[PDB]
Amino acid sequence: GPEMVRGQVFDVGPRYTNLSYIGEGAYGMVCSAYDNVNKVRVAIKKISPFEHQTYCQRTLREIKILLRFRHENIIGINDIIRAPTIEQMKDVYIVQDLMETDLYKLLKTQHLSNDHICYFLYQILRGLKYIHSANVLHRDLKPSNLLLNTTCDLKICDFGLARVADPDHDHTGFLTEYVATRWYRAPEIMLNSKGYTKSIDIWSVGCILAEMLSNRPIFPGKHYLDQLNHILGILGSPSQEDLNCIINLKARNYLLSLPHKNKVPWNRLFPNADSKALDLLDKMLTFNPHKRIEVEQALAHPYLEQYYDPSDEPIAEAPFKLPKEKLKELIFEETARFQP
Ligand SMILES: *CCC(=O)N1CCC[C@H]1c1c(-c2ccncc2)n[nH]c1C
Structure with missing residues (x-):
């Protein structure tokens, strides 16, 4: 089953372990976790925007911008976790440097x-x-x-x-x-x-x-x-x-x-x-x-x-x-x- 944090699904998968709650973002819970590939702790935001056009617009714009940008003084997106199919996708998790x-x-x-x-x-x-x-x-x-x-x-x-x-x-x-x-x-x-x-x-x-x-x-x-x-x-x-x-x-x-x-x-x-x-x-x-x-x-x-x-x-x-x-x-x- 998925990783749970405070009774809620935080489904980041086996790459990311040892979760710790940080806070609430605009569209979901935020945690840190250990990245078993890069061997550092990372930040992960859970985002559930699909019920509202405006939430979808802000999420898509940020993802598009941050995936295009590459600069030392701008946070990147290291990984994005979501279900394999649109039908099964209800949340997205954005992984960034901690x-x-x-x-x-x-x-x-x-x-x-x-x-x-x-x-x-x-x-x-x-x-x-x-x-x-x-x-x-x-x-x-x-x-x-x-x-x-x-x-x-x-x-x-x-x-x-x-x-x-x-x-x-x-x-x-x-x-x-x-x-x-x-x-x-x-x-x-x-x-x-x-x-x-x-x-x-x-x-x-x-x-x-x-x-x-x-x-x-x-x-x-x-x-x-x-x-x-x-x-x-x-x-x-x-x-x-x-x-x-x-x-x-x-x-x-x-x-x-x-x-x-x-x-x-x-x-x-x-x-x-x-x-x-x-x-x-x-x-x-x-x-x-x-x-x-x-x-x-x-x-x-x-x-x-x-x-x-x-x-x-x-x-x-x-x-x-x-x-x-x-x-x-x-x-x-x-x-x-x-x-x-
Ligand atoms: C824009 C920052 C953001 O979205 N974060 C989500 C989790 C906190 C923040 C973040 C940090 C951070 C670490 C320690 N203290 C404050 C913030 N590091 N990376 C991120 C994404």
Whole structure:
């Protein structure tokens, strides 16, 4: 019979033994196990998406992206376990490298040295260069999606909200609902953006840098619109030029209705930070997304001079450009290479 964990089927087969519960993911239980072929412990996510089109779409997109990508700073998929036939397939199990920790757990307990902040930021941006070069947006960068091994090598994980970039279709109305983690949302999400531009990810990286400098989230909004008031409470009121860039009247008039808010100087919020780190932070946390630094510029910033080497910051060879029954078929096909 199958391996059981907490009374539930976790059917990973004889390759993977000595299971240990980790937690609940979006579509199922997550465990670690021992890989008897590669002789290391691995992470395994159980995914049961087939009852809903949206679950199928997020699962298929992540599988397609991660199987195409190959980069040192991006988690891979090592194996995918599923039944031999579509009729018998109800779950899929995704096997990935098991890391030591994530940046969320590290920031809860550990002060980061400036050298560690620098190195972590370099690797995040190196991975993001590759993602963005493939015309993909991650859309949910945050500390728990940054994994670290025992020597502080970093991998970006969780492409369950990723999308192909679509800057020509980014505009939306004021107060449009959004899926990604609140605290890392750029201001434009709450104003006029669907999060279909690369600048969405740079904002989230800027939030992560701020969180590495102080061990606390910089903009911990409690609800949708509070997120924007946190952002404006530090950046201050937008300039006329930046407001003029927001054509949507409801969004612009919301911003015009607010009392004046002063900018909080970065060196006052982060009195212990390197001055070059704060200059780069300022450029990532720029209100106007068109003025916000892009990933390659960030890599070239003086803060990262010890690491920057564009020849060793690879790009993707092959950038990217339905009812649930059809999506089940595509998942079955996309996972076929892992069958014996
Ligand atoms: C995106 C990360 C993910 O999906 N994981 C599922 C299990 C946790 C996480 C993961 C780790 C990890 C190890 C130790 N501490 C935190 C996270 N290592 N690999 C994965 C896939």
